[PDB]
């Protein structure tokens, strides 16, 4: 009993640690795009 | 002779409560083995997650 309740905290935690990486990767993403756009709309300016 | 049959029932009964206890036992001996293998295996999946 002891064993399985360790596993068992072992795989909550492993998954939790993915799922939580996939949001926070996530919102860099989102964050980066901004960036990207913010970027390229300054080009266009600048070349002009 | 009734004492000797009461007596004599009395001991196919202690043989009978005998032979139950060993296979109890036989039963808890197999029971040992399958929990023994059930923690060297989920002793190897914890180190395997950790």
Partial sequence: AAHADEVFSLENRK???ALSMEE???EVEVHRDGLRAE???LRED??? | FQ????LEQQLEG???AI???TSAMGRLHVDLTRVNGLI???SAARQALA
């Fill in chain 1, 24 to 26: 926070r990767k996530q």
């Fill in chain 1, 15 to 17: 998954q939790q640690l």
């Fill in chain 1, 46 to 48: 600048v070349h002009r």
């Fill in chain 2, 3 to 6: 004492k000797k049959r009461r």
């Fill in chain 2, 19 to 21: 032979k139950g206890l």
């Fill in chain 1, 39 to 41: 970027l390229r709309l």
């Fill in chain 2, 14 to 16: 202690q043989g009978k």
């Fill in chain 2, 40 to 42: 060297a295996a989920n």
